[PDB]
Every structure is written in C-alpha cells, then in structure tokens.
Amino acid sequence: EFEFPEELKTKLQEHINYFPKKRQAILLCLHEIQNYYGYIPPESLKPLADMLELPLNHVEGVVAFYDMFDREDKAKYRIRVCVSIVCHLMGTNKLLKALENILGIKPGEVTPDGKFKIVPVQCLGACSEAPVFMVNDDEYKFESEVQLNEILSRYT
Amino acid sequence: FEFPEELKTKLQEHINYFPKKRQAILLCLHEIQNYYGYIPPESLKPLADMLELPLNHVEGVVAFYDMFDREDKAKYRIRVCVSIVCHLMGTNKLLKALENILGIKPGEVTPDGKFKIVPVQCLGACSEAPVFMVNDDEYKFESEVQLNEILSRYT
Amino acid sequence: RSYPAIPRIYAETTLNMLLKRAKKPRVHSIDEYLKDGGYQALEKALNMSPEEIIDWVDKSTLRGRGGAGFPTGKKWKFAVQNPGPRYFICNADESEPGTFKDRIIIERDPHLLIEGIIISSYAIGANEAYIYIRGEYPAGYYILRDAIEEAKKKGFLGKNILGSGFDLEIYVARGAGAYICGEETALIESLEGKRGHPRLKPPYPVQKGLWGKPTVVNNVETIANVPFIISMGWEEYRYIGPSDYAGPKLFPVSGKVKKPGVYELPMNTTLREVIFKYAGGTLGNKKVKAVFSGALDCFSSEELDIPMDYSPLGFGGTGTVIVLTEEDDIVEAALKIAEFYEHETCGQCTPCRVGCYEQANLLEKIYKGEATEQDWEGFDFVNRNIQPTSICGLGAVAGRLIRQTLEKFPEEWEKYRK
Amino acid sequence: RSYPAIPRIYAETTLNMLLKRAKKPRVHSIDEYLKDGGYQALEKALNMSPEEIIDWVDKSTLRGRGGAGFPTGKKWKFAVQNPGPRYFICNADESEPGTFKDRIIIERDPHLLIEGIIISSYAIGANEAYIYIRGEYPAGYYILRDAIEEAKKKGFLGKNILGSGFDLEIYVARGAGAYICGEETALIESLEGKRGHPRLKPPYPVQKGLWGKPTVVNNVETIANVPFIISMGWEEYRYIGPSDYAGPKLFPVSGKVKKPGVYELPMNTTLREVIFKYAGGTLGNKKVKAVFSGALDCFSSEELDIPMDYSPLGFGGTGTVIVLTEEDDIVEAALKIAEFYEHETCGQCTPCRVGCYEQANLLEKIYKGEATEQDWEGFDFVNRNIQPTSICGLGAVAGRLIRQTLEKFPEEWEKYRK
Numbered sequence A: 001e002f003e004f005p006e007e008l009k010t011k012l013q014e015h016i017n018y019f020p021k022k023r024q025a026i027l028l029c030l031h032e033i034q035n036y037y038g039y040i041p042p043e044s045l046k047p048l049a050d051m052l053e054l055p056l057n058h059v060e061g062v063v064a065f066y067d068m069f070d071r072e073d074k075a076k077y078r079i080r081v082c083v084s085i086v087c088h089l090m091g092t093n094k095l096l097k098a099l100e101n102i103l104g105i106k107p108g109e110v111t112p113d114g115k116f117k118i119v120p121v122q123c124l125g126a127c128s129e130a131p132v133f134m135v136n137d138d139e140y141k142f143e144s145e146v147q148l149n150e151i152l153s154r155y156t
Numbered sequence B: 001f002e003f004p005e006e007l008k009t010k011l012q013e014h015i016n017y018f019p020k021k022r023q024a025i026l027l028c029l030h031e032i033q034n035y036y037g038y039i040p041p042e043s044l045k046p047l048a049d050m051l052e053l054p055l056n057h058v059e060g061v062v063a064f065y066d067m068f069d070r071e072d073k074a075k076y077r078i079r080v081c082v083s084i085v086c087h088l089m090g091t092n093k094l095l096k097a098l099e100n101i102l103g104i105k106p107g108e109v110t111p112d113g114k115f116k117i118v119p120v121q122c123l124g125a126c127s128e129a130p131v132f133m134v135n136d137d138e139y140k141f142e143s144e145v146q147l148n149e150i151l152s153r154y155t
Numbered sequence C, D: 001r002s003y004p005a006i007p008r009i010y011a012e013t014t015l016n017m018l019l020k021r022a023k024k025p026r027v028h029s030i031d032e033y034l035k036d037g038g039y040q041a042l043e044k045a046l047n048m049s050p051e052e053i054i055d056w057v058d059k060s061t062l063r064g065r066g067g068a069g070f071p072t073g074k075k076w077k078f079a080v081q082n083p084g085p086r087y088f089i090c091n092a093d094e095s096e097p098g099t100f101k102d103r104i105i106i107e108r109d110p111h112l113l114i115e116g117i118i119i120s121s122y123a124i125g126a127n128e129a130y131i132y133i134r135g136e137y138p139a140g141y142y143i144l145r146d147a148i149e150e151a152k153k154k155g156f157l158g159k160n161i162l163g164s165g166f167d168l169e170i171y172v173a174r175g176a177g178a179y180i181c182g183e184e185t186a187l188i189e190s191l192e193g194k195r196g197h198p199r200l201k202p203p204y205p206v207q208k209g210l211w212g213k214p215t216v217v218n219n220v221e222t223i224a225n226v227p228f229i230i231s232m233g234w235e236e237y238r239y240i241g242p243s244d245y246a247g248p249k250l251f252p253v254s255g256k257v258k259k260p261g262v263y264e265l266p267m268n269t270t271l272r273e274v275i276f277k278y279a280g281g282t283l284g285n286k287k288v289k290a291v292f293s294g295a296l297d298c299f300s301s302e303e304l305d306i307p308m309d310y311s312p313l314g315f316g317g318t319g320t321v322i323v324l325t326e327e328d329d330i331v332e333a334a335l336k337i338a339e340f341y342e343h344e345t346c347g348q349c350t351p352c353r354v355g356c357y358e359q360a361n362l363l364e365k366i367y368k369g370e371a372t373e374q375d376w377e378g379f380d381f382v383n384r385n386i387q388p389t390s391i392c393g394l395g396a397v398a399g400r401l402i403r404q405t406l407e408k409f410p411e412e413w414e415k416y417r418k
C-alpha cells in the first residue's frame, strides 16, 4: 500500500489537529500533498481519507471540485497565468507569448523536464498590476520577456 | 484623628490575618495610602495603637519603605521605571510623552492632585520596557497616542 | 520572516483609516500596530456589553462591503436572536474580477482585520471564528497565521481575553480555486470539509450556518471598519462621508487608468472623480467607453456622475472600477465575462449549469464570426435564461453585465451580426 | 473576578514543565490546574515521610534559583537537624534588574507554587508558611490570595490536610519598595514587622530565622520544581538537562533581542543559544556588545559560548540575560547600575552606605563630563571599597559589574576620561 513519508504525514497531522473537526482540514491537507509531490497522486487519496475519517468518494469528489488541485500532471513549478478580463485587456497574450518563447510550452502543457506547467486561471485579485502571473506561491506583474526571463531563472 | 469605619475594619482584617499583629504593618500602610492617596502623618499614631507598637517604630518603617509617601496626595501614582532595561529601551520617550500630556515631570503632582509621577527602580517587567504603572495597573509604553488613551481611563 | 512575492499594489487615501498603514506596501506587525493605538478599541469594546456594540455598529450605518450592502448591525441582531453557540466568519475569498481591495488589508495591516474579528465575535457571542482565504492568496494566509500568533502572544486571543471572561480562537482555512466558495453558504460548506455548493436561502447563515448554528459571515473590509466605530464612537464615524452611507470605502481601480490601485475615499465621491481626480485619468487620455463594476454591472460614459454609494442610483457592488476606453472592443470584453461565469458555475442548478456554458460557448462563436443565425438567437435566449431556479447570486447575475452591454453598446454588437 | 493590568510577557518552553500553563498569559485557576493532574504530587508526598521527600529533593540536584544556587535538599536537611517549630518562606521579592521569571509563575500558574510550598513545608515540618511578594506586584498578591482560598476549599490547606494529620496555613505578606527585602534575613526582619535590615550570617535562617526559629527560605522558581520532583521521581528529573545541573531553568531575556521574554530551557543551553536560537537574535541584527546578568555580572561578546548552569565557568546567577548591542554606551549603562545600588543600600554598613552613594554620584559627574581628576581616582577607589565590613551580598557586589565593565571595555571608559 501507498504510505506518506513521515515528514509529510507529520504536516498532514498538524492540519488535521488544527481545526475543531478533522474533516475541516481536507483542503489544507490536499494543498500540502500537492506541494510535496508536484500534483495529487491518486494513491494518496485513500490514506488521506482514513486520516480525515471520511469516505474515499467524498475525498475524490472534493479533489475533483477544486481547480487548484491537479491529478494529471506532475510539475515542480506551476505558472498560473490570469486570463480574466483585466489581464486580458492589459496584455495576457504578451505574457503567454513570452512564456512560449522562453519555455517552449503553451497553457495546459508541461516542459519535458517536468519543471514548469502553465496553468490558465481566472482573476488573481491583483488586477492593478495586470497582466498577473504566479510561480507556485509567488505572484508578479509581467513587464516584458527579458523581465520574465530573469524571474523564471530564480526557479531552479 | 480617627480612621473611618470602612477603613478601620479593613485595617483590623489585616491585623487579624497574621499570627502576630505587628506583621500586618506594611499591609496596613498600603491600605492607608490606597485610601487617602498618601500616608497622613496623623494616621500613624492610631495605627501604632492598633498594632501595639511604639509610634516611632511605625515612623521608622514608613521612612524606610520607598512606596509610602507622606508628602504628596495623589489619586493616581504613575510609577515610571528608570532602571537599566527601561532606560535602554526608552524611559526618556515615556517621560517626554508624560510631560506632553500632563505637563509634569518625575516627582511632581498635577495642580488638581490627580496624577503624580514617581520614578521607580526595576518593576520586574523588563521584556516590556519601557514599563509604567498607574496605581496597581501596569503597562508597556508604546507611544504618546497609546499612552494618552490609557491615561484617559483614569478619571 | 519571509513571505511569497506579492505585487506592490498602489494605495492612496483621503481619510487615513483602513489604509493608514496599508497605504505602505509591506507587512505591519503587532508592535507597529500597537504604536498606532491598535487593540485599544478591543479593550474599550470588552468594557461594553455585546448589545451596546451591536447598537453602535447599527447606528454607524455600516453596510456589507462584500458587495450586497446589507446593514451589518442588523445582520448581527438577527444572529443573536437565535440560541448559541454562534460562529463568526471573515470572508476573505475575494475573487471577483477587478477586485483587490481586501488583500491589501490582509497582507499589510492584518491586525486591523483581527481586531475587527475579535470585537465582532464578542458582539455576537461567538467563541470560534474563521477566516476563509482564497487559495490564490498564499502570502495572505501565512501573514494572517503569523499575525494571529502575535495576537495570542499579547493576550488578545485565547481564553479570558484581558480578564473579560471572553474566549476566542480564530482558525484560518484556505480555498482551493472556486469563486463560488465566496458565496456565504458555499463558503460554510467548504469550511465543513465539503464541495462548495450553495444552500437554499432562507435560511440565512444567521439562523442556520456552520454546523447548523447561527453564523455571521462578513467581508474583510466590513470587519476592518469595526475598530474605528468603537474607537471614534458611532456618531463621529457617521461624520465620514454622507450620513446615509457613512464611513471609509475602498475602491479597487484597474484597466486603462494612469494610476491603478486601491483608493480609500468617502462614498459621496462620484465615479468620474474616482477615475479622473484620484486615478489620474485614462491611459493616453483616451475617452472612457465603459466601466465594469467587477463582473456585475457595465456603466457607460453617460453614467460617470453617479455616487459611489449603496443607493438605488449609486455605483454599489464592491466599488470595483474596471475602466475601458474607446478602442476596447466591448464584445471581446463581454466574452471574457462569459468565460468567467462558465468557469465558476457550481452546476447544482440546471439553467445556471447549461446557461453559463452556452453563453460562453456561443459568444465565442459570435466573436470569431463562426456563429449561425440560430447561434445568435440562441445566445440572446440563453443570456436571458440563466437565472431561473437559481439558488444563489451567481445564476442571478451571470447574464446581467452582458445584457447591459447589449443594451448600451448595440452598434458594436451589430458589427458582429452584420 | 478582576485583577490589575499586567503586561503580557512572552514565554516559551522546550520542556513544558514550569511553563506548561504559564506560557499562556492568563491566570490558571484550580480546576484547570487539577485537570492537568495538579495536586497529585502533594497527595503522593503526604504518603511519604518528610525524610524521604528531602532525600528525593537532594538526589534531584535541585539548586537555589534565587541566584546563589545553594543545594536545596542540603538546605532542608540543615533545618530539620534543629528542633521545631520551623517556618517555610517563599521568596517572591524578585527585584533584580532584568529579572521577571518568578512573576509569570505567580501570576499565571499560582497553584504550581502553592503545591510546591505545601510539599516543602511538609518536608521540613513547618505548619506555617509565608509568601513575601514585592509591593510592586499587586496583581500577583491578589492572584495568590485567591488561589490560596481555592486550595483551602479543595482541602489542600488547613488542618489535617487530606487526612494526613499535617496542618498548614500560608500567609501572604507584601513588600513596600525595598530591593534589600529580598535578602533572606532582611525579608525575615520585614515579616517580623520591622525595617528590612540584613542580619549577620551565620547564623543562617535554617538555624535561626523567623522569631529565632529554624526557617527555610527558597525562591519561587526553586519551589515550583518540587511538584515535578515528587511527580516524576528524582531519577527522571535528573534526566532533564546535564546530569550534574539538572532540571528546567527559567531565563528572563530583555534588552536588544527580537523576542524578549521568559524561556524555559535546560542548563546545558549556551548564552549564545539563548540570544540567537531562542530569543531571535539582536534588534537590527546588531553585534552583541555585552550581557548584563542582572546587576551582578557583565559578560563580553567573547564569553557567549558559556553554559547557563551553576558550574564555575558557567553563567550562574538567576539566569537573567540583558543584551546590549554595539551602539549602547557602557558607561551610561554602568551609571544605571550605580544608581540602582545607590537607591537600595540599607545603610547599616558604612562602606556600603557611603560607597553605593559616592559610586553613583561620582559616575554621574564622569558621565556628564564634569568630573575632576580627584573625582576620577575617587570613583576608582570607592568602586573597589564598597565591600569591606559588609554583612550581606549587596555590599559584596555593588561594585562588581561596574568593575567588570572597566576591565572589559577600557577604550570606552578612557574616552570619558578625555
């Protein structure tokens, strides 16, 4: 059977102990799992369900519902590119083009080394700084291709 | 001079508390000071009688212990720590803020008899320097705005 | 110590209240907050009865800053007429297009929000409070957790806060990508560890919420007003702005303005003033074509002299001002709004489920000039028929802004039909 | 119900013993103390002989936490070799600069102290115990009075405690502004209703103390260890920290650190670790210049690698850690130490009376740049001659820290001599 490495299991248990009820920790746990693995491994869900004392189908449904979670593609760094109205107006397409020039990938794709995945997302609430992208937890205004290139060089 | 009933009773409680009456002397003087806003020189003779001590024993004790004040009546004593940690962390800022708000410096009483600033040695709250007390309440000084709001609680 | 990178959103205030510290783009920790007199309102509040606090918030005229403008004191009163235990929820899911007012409070002055939460929880007798922060605000999450520990250190949280006998813990939950989890009942479902499916209302949360118990949900900005109301008193607070819609309000301005960012202004400010007096006018000094109030409304250049208040003729909503100028294609803009709703319908209700999808599907065809005659008449019909049977505000409004563009910019739409 | 305001001192523990409850800045009442297994050490103690309890405390290696580090068990043994009646005194006068470790036990976990007093009193055959708490801890006084009543009501004090036949009353006395009343013999004089004048030692209080009777005086922190020693047994207690200097220790850290407060750590911790690993390093990441061990010792930045134990090369004292950084004027700091001793000499001994006065008066002239050459030589001479004929530790050490600053920071002093 699949088992969580102890360093991850410890963190999962912290989340589970944090709220008054175990099941409230489900999203924090799933975030933590995706942080660890670069995606949600299908196999991870059964042990998580046990820890949450939830049925597996409940956990599966939750993973399916929430768009931040990814069961398909392993990626070290997720480049979330906002495709909503303000970033669109102010130059989402220039950001995507710059990203294709540097990395050779389009939205939904992963680089051959498994390092970068471009993820199109709705409004990230930084619209004054459009066009906006995140790299994992870090968030930035796109200025130009040379600028983007320098930022991405910081992720190794 | 004679103590009011409510205070006499309170003094008698202290005197009855310890095995021997004379052990209650400091609790009694704190009570007197709390009541009057200072130690009335006239209060000491009746206290001595109650403690079954000579008058000058009592006088010697009042003189010895720095918390007791026979000179100045004040409703609120602002005890400001002037020892090493509070000094390092900004006693002088607190004192200036106090002068800005109240118009007095250490050792002085406001004209209305409401506040007296008393410089004291380490108050045992050095992690929260600079420290002050207002009567029995104790606080960290953050700023003049903050201090002003605290003092406004004392009417 | 170290938080994820956050863009430095410009912030400006004429009132120096909610943005007194948050006008500076950095985390203000508890010592800086305390130096500005922070948590003194909490101390004052704890020496009042909960009922007086509710009374003050009521008389302040404070209304929900999350977008609907429900009177806050009145919401509290509804909660407290029901038996406890009760819960307090801070809604930090802020995911409306153009909307970034709440994150600058969270990320720069977290103690302002926390103080507000403690006071509000005390007012309604809640001993357990939650912040639900959207998953795409990771920095906000870490900043709040750290701030909450600071508040614990200093005795503003925990049992018997400042000898009052009032107990409170604040739990920080994270979203995971669903706009709909900002809808107060879907938010509660998510807090309960489930999918974010809105519940039929009534009941409202104040009658039946988290674990079926009386629950107040309030927006970040709403809660951040509460320390001021207590500190100044309700009367002084009511001096700020118009006496019927009083208090500071945050306006997130984006798109084709010279100075995009968050403006703290009174609600008698006009939309024209927001754009031209505060936000520096338009990029290239082009003419304003339209303003999108998030994804909710579309105002034309003929509608700029309206007040930024919660009145029938006012701007209303979140205060979100997305400026489009004369060269911005309105149909292209409409498509993006359709794409937004397509992506966020939870799909419980059939007209919402299929309507949000078809509106986006068909508008894409129109935009690309691949639409048939039926696709056109179909788009019109679907747009008018998303709302039926809907149990939440998303289905109620998914067609609203787009309909307003059809009515206010017929000439541009016609270019796409002919 | 209500107590005077107390600032919320930060507290952190790696051992979860003395600070298991007191890490939280609030009063823990008897029910919460009982829920954590409190008073079961007392029950266990009362099923033991006094002699066995003394033996365990002895074998624990517990040493006096009031600063001298005298072996506690040995002290108790000395007392019980003398005929009764005997008295037990808890020293809560804590007035050393930088020192605030005892008050967080008193104010947050009073039952830990009370339980320790009852066990210690039983061990030495005392039916009458005292807490002497400085007058500037008014909240601590009320908290202890209330806790004592709680313990009476649950039958832990009074006659025939839990059927043992052991009688105990704990009386709480207040100081009134005199640092010297923490010296054990001056404390006793004050308890006897007199001025706080130290007595010639020997005799030690264990031979002749309160009313001339065998009397044990122990520090608050010392006594707070006693429940643990009974609860876990002495073997298990000795397995905390190094085998020779065992058990938890409280370290009150103040001055130029990021996280000032009280730390519960084992005594193998180094001074460097206290400052950098636990207290978060220095304000502004400035270089450490000196640590003042209260008003007793001054350590330089070259002595940071020493253990916080009672060994000859160790930190010793109360564990008080006052951090000065590179900008801090050492002469200005020495003046504050001189002013402290000037203010607290009781005046019985001539070199102490005149020495503490002249040290401060002359050092102030040096500081203000108004000192003559004779003031300089006079200052030096007086610093070296406070101690002769002194009958207590104040006269013995009133020049000690200042002398250490003269030796360790010659450059800074010479700058003042011009």
Ligand SMILES: CC(=O)C1=CN([C@@H]2O[C@H](COP(=O)(O)OP(=O)(O)OC[C@H]3O[C@@H](n4cnc5c(N)ncnc54)[C@H](O)[C@@H]3O)[C@@H](O)[C@H]2O)C=CC1
Pocket (backbone or CB within 6 Å): C064, C066, C067, C068, C069, C070, C075, C078, C093, C094, C095, C096, C099, C182, C183, C184, C204, C205, C206, C217, C296, C317, C318, C392, C393
């Ligand atoms: C900030 C942000 O990202 C977003 C904000 N919104 C805003 O959400 C608003 C719609 O919210 P909702 O559907 O909650 O509105 P409502 O009018 O039904 O209720 C407003 C508040 O008042 C309470 N309330 C309303 N009627 C009540 C009643 N009869 N009794 C008790 N409480 C009542 C209700 O529980 C909610 O807290 C729109 O105006 C948008 O501006 C929408 C999406 C994202």
Ligand SMILES: CC(=O)C1=CN([C@@H]2O[C@H](COP(=O)(O)OP(=O)(O)OC[C@H]3O[C@@H](n4cnc5c(N)ncnc54)[C@H](O)[C@@H]3O)[C@@H](O)[C@H]2O)C=CC1
Pocket (backbone or CB within 6 Å): D064, D066, D067, D068, D069, D070, D075, D078, D093, D094, D095, D096, D099, D182, D183, D184, D204, D205, D206, D217, D296, D317, D318, D392, D393
């Ligand atoms: C916590 C606080 O506010 C302060 C603490 N101190 C500390 O007080 C210490 C000096 O205290 P003292 O003069 O009492 O020390 P000591 O070494 O003479 O005696 C310590 C204890 O051991 C007993 N003791 C020592 N030798 C003994 C003997 N032969 N027989 C019996 N008891 C003995 C003695 O009676 C006292 O309780 C210094 O190290 C300071 O750190 C000083 C000022 C304020």
Ligand SMILES: Cc1cc2c(cc1C)N(C[C@H](O)[C@H](O)[C@H](O)COP(=O)(O)O)c1[nH]c(=O)[nH]c(=O)c1N2
Pocket (backbone or CB within 6 Å): C063, C064, C065, C066, C067, C068, C069, C070, C091, C092, C093, C094, C095, C096, C179, C180, C181, C182, C183, C184, C185, C217, C218, C219, C220, C222, C223, C392, C393, C394
């Ligand atoms: C689809 C959808 C999404 C959201 C909302 C509504 C709907 C229909 N609401 C409004 C929310 O339901 C509720 O009215 C407020 O949180 C109540 O707080 P105030 O009364 O505004 O303080 C909402 N509110 C908020 O504070 N943050 C958010 O992110 C959202 N998101």
Ligand SMILES: Cc1cc2c(cc1C)N(C[C@H](O)[C@H](O)[C@H](O)COP(=O)(O)O)c1[nH]c(=O)[nH]c(=O)c1N2
Pocket (backbone or CB within 6 Å): D063, D064, D065, D066, D067, D068, D069, D070, D091, D092, D093, D094, D095, D096, D179, D180, D181, D182, D183, D184, D185, D217, D218, D219, D220, D222, D223, D392, D393, D394
């Ligand atoms: C001037 C001065 C002042 C104090 C002390 C000494 C001197 C010289 N001592 C130490 C005290 O005399 C005695 O050694 C201890 O109280 C004994 O208890 P322990 O053996 O440390 O538990 C002391 N001890 C303490 O517990 N609290 C205090 O406030 C003081 N103050």
Ligand code: SF4
Pocket (backbone or CB within 6 Å): C180, C197, C198, C344, C345, C346, C347, C348, C349, C350, C352, C353, C390, C391, C392, C393, C394, C395, C396
């Ligand atoms: S109206 Fe739409 S978003 Fe709201 S509950 Fe129904 S399907 Fe879900």
Ligand code: SF4
Pocket (backbone or CB within 6 Å): D180, D197, D198, D344, D345, D346, D347, D348, D349, D350, D352, D353, D390, D391, D392, D393, D394, D395, D396
């Ligand atoms: S050494 Fe100083 S403080 Fe101690 S008894 Fe003598 S005069 Fe008093």
Ligand code: FES
Pocket (backbone or CB within 6 Å): A082, A083, A084, A085, A086, A087, A088, A122, A123, A124, A125, A126, A127, A130, A132, C097, C098, C099
């Ligand atoms: S539209 Fe991209 S961050 Fe808002």
Ligand code: FES
Pocket (backbone or CB within 6 Å): B081, B082, B083, B084, B085, B086, B087, B121, B122, B123, B124, B125, B126, B129, B131, D097, D098, D099
């Ligand atoms: S030096 Fe001021 S409280 Fe200690």
Ligand code: NA
Pocket (backbone or CB within 6 Å): B082, B119
């Ligand atoms: Na002074």
Ligand code: NA
Pocket (backbone or CB within 6 Å): C006, C007, C009, C103, C104, C107, C108
């Ligand atoms: Na921000």
